[PDB]
Subunit: 268 residues, 4 copies
Amino acid sequence: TGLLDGKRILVSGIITDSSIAFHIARVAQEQGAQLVLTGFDRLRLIQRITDRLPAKAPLLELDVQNEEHLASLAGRVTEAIGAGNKLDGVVHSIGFMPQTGMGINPFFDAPYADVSKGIHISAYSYASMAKALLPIMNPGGSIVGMDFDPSRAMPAYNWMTVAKSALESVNRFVAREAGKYGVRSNLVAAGPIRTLAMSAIVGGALGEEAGAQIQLLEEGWDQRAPIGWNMKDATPVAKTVCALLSDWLPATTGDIIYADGGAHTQLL
Amino acid sequence: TGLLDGKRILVSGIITDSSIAFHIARVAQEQGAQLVLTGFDRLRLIQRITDRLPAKAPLLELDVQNEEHLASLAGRVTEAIGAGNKLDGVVHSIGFMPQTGMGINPFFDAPYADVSKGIHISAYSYASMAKALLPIMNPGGSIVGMDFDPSRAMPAYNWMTVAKSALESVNRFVAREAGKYGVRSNLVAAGPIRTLAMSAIVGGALGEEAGAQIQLLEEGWDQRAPIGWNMKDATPVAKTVCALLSDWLPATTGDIIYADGGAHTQLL
Amino acid sequence: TGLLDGKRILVSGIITDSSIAFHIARVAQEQGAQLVLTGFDRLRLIQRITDRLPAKAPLLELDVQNEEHLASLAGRVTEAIGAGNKLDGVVHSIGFMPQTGMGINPFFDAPYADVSKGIHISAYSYASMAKALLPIMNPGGSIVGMDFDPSRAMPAYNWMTVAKSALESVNRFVAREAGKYGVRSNLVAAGPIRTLAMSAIVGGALGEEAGAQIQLLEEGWDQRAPIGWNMKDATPVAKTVCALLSDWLPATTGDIIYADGGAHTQLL
Amino acid sequence: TGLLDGKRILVSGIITDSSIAFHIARVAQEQGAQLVLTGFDRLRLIQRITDRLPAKAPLLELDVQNEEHLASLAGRVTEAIGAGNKLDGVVHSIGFMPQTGMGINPFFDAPYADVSKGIHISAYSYASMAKALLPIMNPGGSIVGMDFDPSRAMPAYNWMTVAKSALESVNRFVAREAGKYGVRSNLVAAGPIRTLAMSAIVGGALGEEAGAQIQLLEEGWDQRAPIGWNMKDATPVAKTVCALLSDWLPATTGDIIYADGGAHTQLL
Ligand SMILES: NC(=O)c1ccc[n+]([C@@H]2O[C@H](COP(=O)([O-])OP(=O)(O)OC[C@H]3O[C@@H](n4cnc5c(N)ncnc54)[C@H](O)[C@@H]3O)[C@@H](O)[C@H]2O)c1
Ligand SMILES: NC(=O)c1ccc[n+]([C@@H]2O[C@H](COP(=O)([O-])OP(=O)(O)OC[C@H]3O[C@@H](n4cnc5c(N)ncnc54)[C@H](O)[C@@H]3O)[C@@H](O)[C@H]2O)c1
Ligand SMILES: NC(=O)c1ccc[n+]([C@@H]2O[C@H](COP(=O)([O-])OP(=O)(O)OC[C@H]3O[C@@H](n4cnc5c(N)ncnc54)[C@H](O)[C@@H]3O)[C@@H](O)[C@H]2O)c1
Ligand SMILES: NC(=O)c1ccc[n+]([C@@H]2O[C@H](COP(=O)([O-])OP(=O)(O)OC[C@H]3O[C@@H](n4cnc5c(N)ncnc54)[C@H](O)[C@@H]3O)[C@@H](O)[C@H]2O)c1
Ligand SMILES: CCCCCCc1ccc(Oc2ccccc2C)c(O)c1
Ligand SMILES: CCCCCCc1ccc(Oc2ccccc2C)c(O)c1
Ligand SMILES: CCCCCCc1ccc(Oc2ccccc2C)c(O)c1
Ligand SMILES: CCCCCCc1ccc(Oc2ccccc2C)c(O)c1
């Protein structure tokens, strides 16, 4: 009955019940997946939030900048799912960029220390998670990361745009390695969604009238998308990730699927 | 429970049992879809062939160069599915190019009458099919066409490459129109499949070493594809089309999904 | 001293002194090129207009839909430049689309007869001109066509967008053939310029407030371009074509150079 | 009359006489440019090497990881060219990636400290160079960086591919900033050149069969390039950079010009 019935899927990146990762998890459970969740830093909050999911799942700590976390991850996952069992899916839904790299802060004024942290967490970690988890993935499995189309420059997105360009390149190399395991690796380039990162990171860096410029972003996206766009609903994006986690896109890898209402296909 | 359970899907483009359309149809039926078939010219042959599908489906005649077939199509489909009922999906799996625009035959020697017929059938008709059928499609519905990545030139594909470039452009305009119906329009860019068109029609224009060149094509595509590629197997491509016809990719339109083993994402 | 000193260059597509082809010619002559001009239909007007160029050049009739014109072209050119002499450059600056294929006229309502004519003239003719002229081009030579970025759908451009997508594919195949002669083939994707086609074809199809929507197009383009954009000046575009005609881009072929103020590299 | 007659151009990235920068510098000088050179670490060696350029040029030290070098660069360049004078051109020909992120060394085994150093030098520093030098550039000026098409993954280029993806994104944001100065920013995507970095640094990480693999690379690139390709010859690439530094591409910014023999436009 369910799209992901019996599949074992690790989902990273829940911070709140607005997180793209929250809705990926919710939809995957509705579709029968058995999940292992990973969280960063604010584990007490994340435990509270993940209790709003349809079903209980183990929560494991994972700071992608922490070499020890990464080194122990496959073992901790194997403890969570049981020896002899492997993952069928991995979801990377993780990003960060310091305020200097975002918004109205001048592009040239971001120190490399800041950019590097943003790139570590937002791009490099996709390789490092694939490295840790591929040895415990089943053939036919699927690794999915979250992208925002960086093909053209734009206001505010600034150095996160650079990190996503890097992520897209990483994805294609992860696909090379994953292929050896019979595993797919893809990115979902999503339209704008009202998440914590959108409000705290992107919004925080926009200065004043941020709420209006964000309302503006929604209205422009909605206009450009032939099927419209709603920033208040992550479900279409979560369903898309779930399609990639399923057996229904078996010949797609190294690739990007655009869950953006088709906005990137239209000039105006 | 099937991926496509309860959905009404029109599938064009069956001519042989090796046709991509034939496999899209089989998989759609295994996933619970009710089909309406359309066929060109050899309707007795198509009728016979499709008696070997999992389930019986009505078959209607459609020559996309015949403006009368196109003018009557919606009413004919309505009769086939029952008045009041609408289509949830449309599959355009239609291609033609005179052999003169293909193979070892010189690119410059294809006369425009030939090229134009190919473009008419291969690209323009995606818009005329959508024009005819959009008025009888449900919101949430899905139009899917078949592509072969024409972003780069290549031996032998010649003027068909040009027609696929046109088609990708047509798809994006179709999406604009389909969106007003709450309908999606996308293409599936498939890797090479050992269909009789590939082997016999195109392989027809390929010379005395055609068989070897086709095996060589397979070997190279399989090398390049991080997850491998089997030209003998249409199933991954048909599953990809079904994915688009399902409700699992609801924010994707005007777009292209590559079902090519990830080959296009790799240089070597 | 001149960029194109001693080079023999055929320039097609002058209709008025606002034509992109007019400015290509003007700039090429300023840079020392010896030109052969081709014109369509309105030869008396074109003769008057081409008398405003810095220097005299032979004018030859060429309707790209006329098989006889095309068949006699190399011979007529050889008569214009002298036996034993060959062309170093060819400029395709030609396009057409009937009103049904443009503007506010519904996309689905363009008859294929119309689209086909537009595609013949705007895309297919790039191959047919290359076919006629390559046998009289010097190695090191350069064929350049004019493009408008069709990667995304947009209002008004409609079926001309499809023709340019087709042109881009043709260009990459012409590059295959041209390479055998030691000749480059490239397209210049220009920003919007106030030419006859812009006003009569694009403007004519836009209905009412066309002048304001065109003013609007300029202002949006100017905003999106990091170095700004001026629709009233074709010179930056002509200089770009001249760069391609020169010896200064010797390793570029099958390709597209964007003379659009960088607008296509910016989302907003 | 030289292409670059009277222009003042800063050229970074000479380390050996096989350096792409070395050839850009030679060609620029043959075309009448006045150069300022910048070099990293081995300044005595660079001084010696560049004594073999057509013309003597001042050489300044620049480690792009040294924020003091970057803070003083504009003033140091001004002293070199004379106060009141400004630069017309800047060439970023700087790349680095620890061998650990290259060759037959496993993609997953490159530690982030290594990758980050590579990204810093290879991508971030394009923005910090532009930051430093924009204030002393003339309108109409041109910043040019060196790229290797990273749109697809590939053997051996590994993390450098990721850094070039980042760089292409950085280029587009640099263009936004440079436009306020009336300055252009573009990359040249070069085909493989048998520079000592290619052979010795990268070829260093390539195994016991490295030489053969490099010849194989050349043979395949030459096959794919419609106009052919010679890895032994930097001249076409240097001419391409000079083209961008000239006034002949004045509407192009935030962009990428492929000097690769047209290889990227061909599948096979
Ligand atoms: N919201 C949008 O509009 C949008 C659009 C396209 C793509 N995305 C992408 O979706 C993904 C999820 O972001 P979101 O929008 O759901 O916002 P979010 O705030 O809900 O999630 C971001 C996650 O990043 C995690 N994270 C940060 N640093 C980490 C670290 N060192 N280790 C482990 N995890 C870390 C945070 O814990 C948080 O859970 C990101 O890749 C984001 O770039 C978002
Ligand atoms: N076989 C491959 O490797 C491959 C790869 C990528 C894309 N494609 C595309 O997939 C689609 C299916 O091709 P296939 O390989 O299954 O070949 P096919 O010959 O089985 O299918 C082509 C269909 O086009 C139909 N057709 C031709 N003229 C028509 C007309 N005037 N009106 C209506 N229908 C007409 C034919 O009847 C046939 O049913 C085509 O668009 C093709 O370009 C094929
Ligand atoms: N004006 C712009 O904004 C713009 C932008 C990008 C690309 N372009 C391209 O520039 C090229 C030149 O157009 P333009 O804008 O200078 O307008 P234009 O009206 O000055 O030139 C169009 C030319 O097409 C020629 N032509 C039409 N049918 C022909 C035929 N059958 N045979 C031979 N020639 C024929 C006409 O004679 C005319 O000289 C076209 O390819 C156009 O698509 C224009
Ligand atoms: N060789 C090729 O085939 C090829 C192809 C495409 C692009 N490229 C690019 O061309 C550029 C030139 O490479 P090359 O092949 O001439 O190799 P190279 O080794 O001659 O040049 C690289 C330059 O990077 C400089 N550099 C390294 N670290 C630096 C630092 N911290 N500060 C300042 N400078 C530093 C080195 O000193 C050297 O001068 C690089 O960006 C490279 O990626 C090379
Ligand atoms: C106005 C800027 C353009 C629209 C932003 C849409 C967006 C919103 C949030 C996103 O997530 C992040 C962004 C930056 C840093 C970290 C994260 C998770 C993200 O990746 C994309
Ligand atoms: C030429 C070698 C390149 C690989 C061929 C892959 C392919 C095979 C068949 C295809 O379909 C057609 C092609 C031409 C004419 C008609 C059809 C259905 C098609 O569109 C693509
Ligand atoms: C509002 C539409 C989008 C901007 C149009 C810019 C433009 C203007 C003129 C062009 O030339 C032609 C256009 C259509 C048909 C024929 C030609 C020559 C052309 O190719 C492009
Ligand atoms: C790996 C095989 C792929 C072809 C290599 C072409 C190439 C060669 C050299 C290049 O420059 C560098 C690469 C890595 C580190 C430093 C430099 C300068 C570079 O950027 C690209």
